[PDB]
């Protein structure tokens, strides 16, 4: 279906000694494909998916050059924002940046985004028109006026509608064997008696990709809200994801209850019931 490419940057200052810790990760959909860690030994942008290793040395030299420059930009920003907010040199602070582009199922541009946060709160973000900025506070409007002067939204809109979608489209074909494969959830139901009159039914979705999924409980064909627990989708560690939903039922009444599983890898949604 639809697809995205996204880059995530975190930089954390170290007041006690040295320069900030800097971590950058790149994703196509839910697949991490590149990484950079300032405390790693290589000091290079590194591959994390087999289909990006095909790329030649021009690619890896350029991506290393870029990400190391971005590390320095965040370093400067950490100092600048420390002044904007009148904070001491004694504390540790955080800058985070995320940007990327989505394409539709026809692999054509859908939307772009570029967002910036200081100490875990919105600082400045590009609006969906890719022309305007949302500044969260007055420090951020200082940045906004600076970026209006420097044509920043211009360059971002060019990349996000052009370069970004072009290279996403290149990755999708080079990595076709995994990136365009859907892994539908392997589902089953487990039963856990909690007394001689009550039991937990747990509906499991395992080893699925992409991470987006809906698990819902129904009782007698209608949405069951009470006594349900739904955990956050979580990585399996092998590139796929897991999720479960549970409901407490009176013992012997298990058949009234159905778990419903929606996922891009299933042509029609799935229905499970304890026997």
């Amino acid at each position: 279906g639809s697809h995205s490419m996204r880059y995530f940057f975190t930089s954390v200052s170290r007041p006690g000694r040295g320069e900030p810790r800097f971590i950058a990760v790149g994703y196509v959909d839910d697949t991490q494909f590149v990484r950079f860690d300032s405390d790693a030994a290589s000091q290079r942008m590194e591959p994390r998916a087999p289909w990006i290793e095909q790329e030649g040395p021009e690619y890896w030299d350029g991506e290393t050059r870029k990400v190391k420059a971005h590390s320095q930009t965040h370093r400067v920003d950490l100092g600048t924002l420390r002044g904007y907010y009148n904070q001491s040199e004694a504390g540790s602070h955080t800058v985070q940046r995320m940007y990327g582009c989505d394409v539709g199922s026809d692999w054509r541009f859908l939307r772009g985004y570029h967002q910036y946060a200081y100490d875990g709160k919105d600082y400045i973000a590009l609006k969906e028109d890719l022309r305007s900025w949302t500044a969260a506070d007055m420090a951020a409007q200082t940045t906004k006026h600076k970026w209006e002067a420097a044509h920043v939204a211009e360059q971002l809109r060019a990349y996000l509608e052009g370069t970004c979608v072009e290279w996403l489209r290149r990755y999708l074909e080079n990595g076709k064997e995994t990136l365009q494969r859907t892994d539908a959830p392997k589902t089953h139901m487990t039963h856990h008696a909690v007394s001689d009159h009550e039991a937990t039914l747990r509906c499991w979705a395992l080893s699925f990709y992409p991470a987006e999924i809906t698990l819902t409980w129904q009782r007698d064909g209608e949405d069951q809200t009470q006594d349900t627990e739904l955990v956050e989708t979580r990585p399996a560690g092998d590139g796929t994801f897991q999720k479960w939903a549970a409901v407490v039922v009176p013992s012997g009444q298990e058949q009234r209850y159905t778990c419903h599983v929606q996922h891009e890898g299933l042509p029609k949604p799935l229905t499970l019931r304890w026997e």
């Binding site: 870029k66 971005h70 930009t73 940046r97 600076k146 360059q155 370069t163």
Partner: peptide
């Protein structure tokens, strides 16, 4: 592929 340049805040 990363964006080539980020202006400072």
């Amino acid at each position: 592929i990363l964006l080539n340049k980020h202006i400072d805040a």
